[PDB]
Amino acid sequence: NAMFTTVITPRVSETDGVGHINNTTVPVWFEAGRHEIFKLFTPDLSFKRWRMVIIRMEVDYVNQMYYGQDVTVYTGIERIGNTSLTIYEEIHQNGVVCAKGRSVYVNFNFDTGRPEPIPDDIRVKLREHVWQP
């Protein structure tokens, strides 16, 4: 119920010579779906005040996707850890799941030079976007 929803229009440049969306495009669309999450950690989205660092990703390529039809990225929180969070995410096209992903990010405080227990205000915000399939 609580996931973020991001509609994207595929581009010719995101295909490859096989005629489908290229596999390296999927992490690009998944990162696009994390936008609202990034915004919770860095409200002005300034790279001066950037906090989010990926440490792991996994993607299952379930069905091929095509240039010419929109896709929808669903992005939710599978686990809120201490200094990390594990995202669950899916890409759909034509109402069919085509890619499923998980990613783990660490909230890194560059000012203090250490991973930072996610502040409480953020945890509350994140709890209302939990998605556990």
21-29, 49-57, 83-91, 116-124 -> range binding Mg ion (CB under 5 A): 21-29
CB neighbour list of residue 13: distance below 8 Å, 6 or more residues apart: none
Instruction: Indicate if the alpha-carbon torsion angle 43, 47, 52, 57 is positive or negative.
Output: positive
Beta carbon nearer to a copy of itself, 53 or 127: 53
Beta carbon nearer to a copy of itself, 2 or 45: 45
Shortest distance in whole angstroms from residue 48 CB to a copy of itself: 8
The strand ranges marked E within the chain are 4-8, 52-61, 71-80, 84-93, 96-109, 114-115
Q: Taking CB within 5 to 8 Å according to partner kind, which of a copy of itself, Mg ion, none is near residue 119?
A: none
Q: Is 20 in the site for a copy of itself (CB under 8 A)?
A: yes
Q: Taking CB within 5 to 8 Å according to partner kind, which of Mg ion, a copy of itself, none is near residue 56?
A: a copy of itself
State the amino acid at position 102 in one-letter form.
Answer: R
9-17, 41-49, 86-94, 112-120 -> range binding Mg ion (CB under 5 A): 9-17
CB neighbour list of residue 52: distance below 8 Å, 6 or more residues apart: 34, 37, 38, 41, 42, 105, 106, 107, 108
Structure tokens at 132: 């556990």
Which residues contact a copy of itself (rule: CB under 8 A)? 6, 9, 11-13, 15-20, 22-25, 27-28, 31-32, 35, 38, 44-48, 50, 53-61, 64, 66-68, 110
